[PDB]
Amino acid sequence: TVNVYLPDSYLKGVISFSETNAIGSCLLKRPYLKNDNTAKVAIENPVIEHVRLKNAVNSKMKISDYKVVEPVNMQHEIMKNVHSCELTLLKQFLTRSKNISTLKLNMICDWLQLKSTSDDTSILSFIDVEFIPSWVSNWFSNWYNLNKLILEFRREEVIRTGSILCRSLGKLVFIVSSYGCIVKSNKSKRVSFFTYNQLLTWKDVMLSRFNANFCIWVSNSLNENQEGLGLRSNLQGMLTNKLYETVDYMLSLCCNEGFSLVKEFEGFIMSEILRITEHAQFSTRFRNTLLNGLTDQLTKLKNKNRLRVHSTVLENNDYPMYEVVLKLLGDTLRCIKLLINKNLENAAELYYIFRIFGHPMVDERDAMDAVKLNNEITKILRLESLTELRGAFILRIIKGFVDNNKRWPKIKNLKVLSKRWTMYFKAKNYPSQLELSEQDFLELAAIQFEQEFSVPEKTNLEMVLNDKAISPPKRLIWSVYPKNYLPETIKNRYLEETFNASDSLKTRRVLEYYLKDNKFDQKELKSYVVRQEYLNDKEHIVSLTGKERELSVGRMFAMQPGKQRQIQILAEKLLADNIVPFFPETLTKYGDLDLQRIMYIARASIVTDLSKFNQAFRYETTAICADVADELHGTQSLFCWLHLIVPMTTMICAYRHAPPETKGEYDIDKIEEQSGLYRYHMGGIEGWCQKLWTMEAISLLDVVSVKTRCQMTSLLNGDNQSIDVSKPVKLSEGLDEVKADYRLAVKMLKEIRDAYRNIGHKLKEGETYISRDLQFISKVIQSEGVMHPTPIKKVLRVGPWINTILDDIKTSAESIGSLCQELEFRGESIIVSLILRNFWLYNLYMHESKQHPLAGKQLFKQLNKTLTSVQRFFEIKRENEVVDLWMNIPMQFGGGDPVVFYRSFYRRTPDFLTEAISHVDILLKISANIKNETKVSFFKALLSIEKNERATLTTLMRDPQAVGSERQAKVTSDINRTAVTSILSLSPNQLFSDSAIHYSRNEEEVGIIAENITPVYPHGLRVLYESLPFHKAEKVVNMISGTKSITNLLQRTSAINGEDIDRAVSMMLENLGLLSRILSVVVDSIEIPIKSNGRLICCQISRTLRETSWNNMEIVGVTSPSITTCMDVIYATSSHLKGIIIEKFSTDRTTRGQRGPKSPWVGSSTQEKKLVPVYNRQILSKQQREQLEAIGKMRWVYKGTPGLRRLLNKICLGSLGISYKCVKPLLPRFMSVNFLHRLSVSSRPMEFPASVPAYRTTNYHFDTSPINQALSERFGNEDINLVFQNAISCGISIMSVVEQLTGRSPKQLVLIPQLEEIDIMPPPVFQGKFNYKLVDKITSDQHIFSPDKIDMLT
C-alpha cells in the first residue's frame, strides 16, 4: 500500500558511467563524455527522471552559459570550499568523548591497581581541544554540511517517491535527485553533471579523510607526551594534507585517468619498503620495473583522453601537458617519501591512500573491449608441459588419498602404468620429490580414474538460496533496459514474448526465481548434468555488470541464468568439499597457513600477481585437470562448462542504461559485433573457476620443482600467488649470500615465466617482482617476524549509519564498535580507540537520532525517557554525566556501549552476560558521583523478573547464552521470522509453502523433545538442533530476512514497505528503553550474594538471573567466572603465594616492535579427543559427515538416558534413510567424561586468542602450575569452571595495556583467583525421558532440506 525508495547513506555500490553520460546528454542535448549509442538514445527518447531534471534545471540557471566540466574536475573546488565553521561542534563532541574515555580508563585502572598524582592531565588532557591544528576541521565542516544535505535529501525522498533538492553550499550550489544531480560553481563558472554515486563518494572521501587525520593527530599528541600510548607512527598532518590537495589537483586536471595512475601508489610504497628492508639488488629492480610502466601510462594518457573526447563537449577543452603532470607526480611522491622517513610502520599505516582519493568512474564497455583483445587470441601450447601439468595434478590427488584414506584411488585400467607405478600401487605410498622427474609425470598423465566420489542427488537449498543477481534469459533480456530506449518492433516482440514464458524467467533475483517457481523438482540437476542439456543451451546469456572495486578501471562481474548458475555453484561446492583438500596451499590460507606456521640454503621469494589471470585460460589449458576432477566426480562434463557453453553465447554488459546499437532484430546472436557485445569469448570469466585455476597454478610449481631441484612452497592470499624457494647452493666462500640469492631468484623467475609462456600467459614485468623474504602474506607487512599493522583501513568509514540494511542504532553502534576495536586487536592505542569510538557514538545518539528518516523525533523522545528514568534511579544532579553513565553500559541492558569489557583483553568468551555484569559492576563501583545502596539495587532490578511466561527452548537452541522473559534484545531475525513465514506460505513453490506452514508447528514441537529433562544442557540442545533438518531451514529464513525488503519478494518493486518500516521502528523503540523496563520495578527481598572482599561475585548473580528468567531449569555448563572480577592482578618478581605468573623475556622498557624466541600463544580448546572412524569418508557428502558427527555427539552427551536410542534411530531414519544400528560403526567414538570442557561445537569457541598480535604475544612466558595447590585443596581434583587459556590471554592483554599506559612494562605479574566467584562443574546425570515421536513428523515436513538418502553403501 505504501512503498519507499530510500537511498543509501554510503556508497554500498559502484559509480557507473552510462548513467552519467545519459544524465549529461539529456540536459546538454549533446553527447557528454562519449558519443556511443547511450548518447543518441538519451537525446532522442529521454526518460522520465532525466526529463524532470531537465525541467528543474531549466527553471533554474541556464546550462548553455557555463563550461560543463566533468565531475572529476571539481574535486579541488569541493575539497577547498568553506562552509560555516562547525569546529564548536567538533570540540563539543571531542570533550564529551574525552569525559567518557576518562570514565572508562578509571574503570580499567581501578581493578588494574593503577593511580596517579591527582594530576588533571591524568591521561586525557594531552589533546588540548582548543589547539586543534585545523587540518581536520577543513574536512569536518565540509563533511558535516554535505551529510546534512544528504540527510535532508533522504528525509524528503522517503516522503516523495521523487524529489529535486536544490541546496546552496558556499560557492557550490548542488541539485540532488535519486537518479541525477548537478553542481554549479558560481566562483569558477563551471557545471558538472553526475549522480548519487559520485555525490556521496566525496562524502565517504571526506569522512575517511577526517577520521584518518584525527586518528593520527590524537596518536602523535599522545606520543609527544608518552611514547607508546599512541599508534606507532609519525605522520605529519600538514604534509599529508598537502599530499591530498596535490593529488586532488592532478585528478582534477587528468579527467578520468589519474585513478589508473594512482594505482601505482601501492607499487611505489612497496618499493620504498623494499629499499628500507633490503639492499639495492631488489629495491632498484622493483623501482625501475614500476617506473617504466608508470611513465608509459603517463605518456599514453593524452591519447586516451583525446580518443574518448571525440564528438563531445570537451574537445574544446585541453589536457595537461606532460611536464606539469610530471611535476605533480614529483610533488606527491616527495610527500609519500617524506611521510615515510625510513619507517616501516609509517609506510605500513600509509596504505589507506588507495581508497582515500575516491573510486574511479568505471566505464561499462571499455574494460570489456580492452579484455576482448586478450580473450580472442589463439595461443600456442606445448603438449609436454601440458601433460606435465596433468601429471602433477594426479600426484597431488594421490598424495591426498594416501594421506587421508590410506588407499589408492580406483583406476579403470591397471595397464597404463609402468612397473614402478605398479609396485607403488601395491605399496600405497608416494615418491619423495627428489624423484618424479619429467618422464614420471608424463606417464602418470595416462591414468583414467573411475567414479570414486558421487554427486548429491537433491539440490542443497542452503547453497542454492543466496541473494545474488541473476541475468535474465536470452530472449527475455530487453526488460533490463528502459521501455523508452528500445524500438517499437523490439518492444512489441518483447511484450508478446513475455507471455510464452512462465513468471520464473522474468526475475533478476535468485530468491524470487526459486520462490515464484511452479514446477521445481529437487532431483533435476542430477538429470541435467548427466544428460548434458546445456552444451547447446540456446536460452543462454552472460551479462557483465561491471561491478568493481577500488582504484582500477575494470572488474566485470558476471550474471548468468539460474539453470547455469546452479551448475557453477554445484561445481564450486563439489570442489570445495572433495578436491580442494588434498591441497594445503589453498583452503588453509585464511586462519592457519600464514599467521602461525610459515614463520648455504639459498632462500628467496616471488609475489606474482594473478588478478588479471582469468582471461588467459582456454579449454585446451584447463580441461586437462578439469577432466581428471570430473572422472573422480563421475560425470562426462561438469567442470569444463565455462569453456564449453560460453563461446557460443553473447556478452551484453547489461547495465540499467547502456543499450546495444540494435537495428531492429531480436536475436542477439544476429547483431553485428558492437563495442558492448562480442559473441566468441574463447576465455574464462572472473570467479567462475577460480579454485580450479588456483589448482593448476599450484600444480605447475611442482613441475618447475622437478625440472629444477629446489624446494618450492606457495601461499595464495586472495588474488595473488606468493612462492617461497629454498635451494642448497653448495658453492660458497666468495659472494656470500646476496648475489647467490639474487641469481637463484632471477633463474627461478625465468623458469616460472617460461613455464607460463608454454601455457599461454604473458606475465608482465610490473605485476610480478622479487624479494628475499615474502613480505606480503595476507597484506600485513611482516619484517623479521614483527607484524607491522595496517590499523587505519577499517576505521575510515565508521561514521553513523554504517553497515545497516535499515537505519538501526543498535546495529550501527555495534558495527562502529567492531571496526574501531581493530585499533586494539590489530592496532595499539586503545586510548585512540576509546576516543574515536565515543566521538562517533555521541554523534549517532545525541545529534543524529533526532532526524531519523523513518520515525523522526520518536527515537530521541525514547532516549530522553530512559535517560530520565536512569537519572531518577541513580540520583544524578547534572545531566552532562547521565549520558556518560548510559553510554558506558552494554547493549543487552539498553545502554549504548558495544565494546564489552572482555572484548578489550580477550576476543572470544563464554557468558557474555556475566562479562557485561562484571563490567557494569566495576563501573558502578568506581563511579564516585552516585550514592551507595543504588549500585547494589541495580542488580536487584536486573533480578526482579516477570518470569511466568512460556518456557520455550528453541530460544536456547538458537542462542545457548540467552536470557528470556523479554530481557533479550529482539533482533531482525526473530522479529521478521513470522513475517517471512507468512510470505513464504503464499508462494507457488509447493515445497516451500508446505515447509513454511509447518514451520511454526515444528518450532513449537522441538522444545517438547527435551522439555522434561533435568539438567537442560543448552549445547546439547544445540547439537539436537543441528542434527535435525530444521537448522538449514532456520538458516535460510535468517538469510532471507536481512534483505532490506522482506514483504516484496513476489513483487517487482525494489522498494521497502511501510510494514517493515514500522516493524524496524518498533524494534529500535522497544530495544532502547529496555533500561527503563528493567529499572521500573525494584524488589528489596533478595539477599544478594555479596562478598567480604569489597566486591560482588558476578557468577552467583548471573546464574540466578538466568535461572529466574528460565523458571529454575538448572542450566549446567553455560557460565564462566569472568577473568575481570575474580582473577585479580599484582605486579611482582618471582615471589608470591603460587598464583599464575607471566614473565617478560627482555629488559627493554617497552615490549613492542619485537619477536622473541617463543612460538606464539594461541589457545586451543583441546576439544574432541577423537577415535575417528577409519572407514571411507569420501562417498559421504559434507552434510552427511556433519550429521554423523552430530549423532555421535548426541551419543556422547546423553548416555544411559531413556529413549535416546529410539530418538537417534528415528532421526537417522528420517534424515539419512538408514537405521542407527547399521550406522553405529560409522560414527566417531569419543571417550571422555568431561564433555562440558571437551565438546567445542558451534556457539562455543574452540580458540581463545588474546587482544594483541602475535609479535606482541611472542615475548611473554607463563606458568600456571602454582595454582594447582589452591585448586586441589579447596576444590577436588575434578574439573574447574575457569578457562586458563582465557586467563592467560587476558594477562597478556594486561601486560599490553600496562606497557601502553605506563612506558615501564612489569618484569613479572601474577594473577590470583578468588575462589568465591569460581564454581565447579561435575559432569551431570541426565534424569528424564525424551519425547521422540515428534521427530517423525518434523522430518516428514522438513525433508527438502534433509541430506540425500543412502540406499546401499554399508
Binding site: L381, L383, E384, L386, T387, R390, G391, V416, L417, S418, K419, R420, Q439, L442, E443, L444, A445, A446, Q448, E450, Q451, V455, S527, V530, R531, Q532, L535, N536, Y619, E620, A623, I624, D627, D630, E631, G634, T635, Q636, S637, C640, H643, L644, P647, M648
Partner: protein, 66 residues
C-alpha cells in the same frame, strides 16, 4: 640387458600414451561438444550408464503396469 632393454620400451611408450591422452582431451572441447562427439571421444563416465539403466528398467517395469 636382455630384460633391461624393454623396460625402457614400456616406459617410453607409456610416456606417449600419456601425451596422446592429453592431446585427445585438448582436441575434445567446445568444437566436438558443439555437435555431440565429445562424449564418444572421451568415453562414458559411469553416470550416463546409471541414467540409461534407470530409464530402461523403468520402461521395463512399466510393462507389468498394464
Amino acid at each position: 640387458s636382455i630384460e633391461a632393454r624393454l623396460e625402457s620400451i614400456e616406459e617410453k611408450l607409456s610416456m606417449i600414451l600419456g601425451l596422446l591422452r592429453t592431446l585427445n582431451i585438448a582436441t575434445a572441447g567446445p568444437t566436438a561438444a558443439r555437435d555431440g562427439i565429445r562424449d564418444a571421444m572421451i568415453g562414458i563416465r559411469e553416470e550416463l550408464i546409471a541414467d540409461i539403466i534407470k530409464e530402461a528398467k523403468g520402461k521395463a517395469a512399466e510393462m507389468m503396469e498394464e
